[PDB]
Design a protein around this ligand. Structure first.
Ligand SMILES: *[C@@H]1O[C@H](CO)[C@@H](O)[C@H](O)[C@H]1NC(C)=O
Length: 182
């Protein structure tokens, strides 16, 4: 069985609980994760973005397959959602889709929970161990049947026209740690 994902406190990461996913670097490399709009006067939709400093918002993973002990493990497809209140017309769940004013594939909101058919597989991400102490990365390669349209790849950050930090799929990858919210 894939080694378990661990929070900064060395305790296992679980489904159903709030975490902050924060840059694994201290005193640098940005803060944790939030959402944000086009930067165009346009308010919506929201894309997942890294806060330059603060821990950002609480995040909840949820299993694609029932997990007995409820522990998040390496390289397993899972859903991510922010636990928060948003003003847009979409769910808080993460997915990969195109985003306005951003070239490529952006991690945005409006994702699906569970697997049913292809579309749902855009909301499946895997976490995998990374280089730095306590670090993990988000990798996208759903293990469920999907179309060829979205390339398997790592998530990193991108500074777009407005100097905002988007999440996108790209060769390189960002290294985060998980911190229990409470
Ligand atoms: C999500 O946030 C609410 C408060 O808005 C809180 O009551 C709850 O504990 C959090 N987590 C889950 C899993 O609902």
């Amino acid at each position: 069985a894939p080694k378990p994902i661990v929070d900064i406190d060395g305790k296992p990461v679980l489904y159903g609980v709030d975490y902050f996913v924060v840059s694994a670097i201290w005193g640098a490399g940005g803060g944790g994760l939030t959402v944000y709009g086009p930067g165009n006067k346009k308010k919506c939709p929201l894309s997942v973005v890294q806060d330059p400093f603060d821990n950002g918002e609480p995040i909840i993973f949820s299993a694609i397959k029932n997990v007995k002990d409820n522990i998040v493990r390496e390289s397993v497809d899972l859903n991510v959602k922010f636990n928060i209140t948003i003003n847009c017309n979409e769910t808080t769940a993460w997915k990969v889709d195109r985003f306005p004013g951003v070239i490529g594939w952006t991690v945005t909101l409006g994702g699906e929970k569970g697997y049913h058919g292809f579309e749902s597989t855009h909301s499946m991400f895997k976490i995998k161990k990374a280089g730095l102490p306590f670090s993990y990365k988000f990798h996208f390669c759903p293990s469920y049947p999907r179309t060829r349209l979205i390339p398997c790849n790592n998530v990193d950050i991108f500074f777009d026209k407005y100097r905002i930090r988007r999440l996108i799929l790209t060769n390189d990858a960002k290294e985060f740690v998980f911190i229990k919210t409470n």
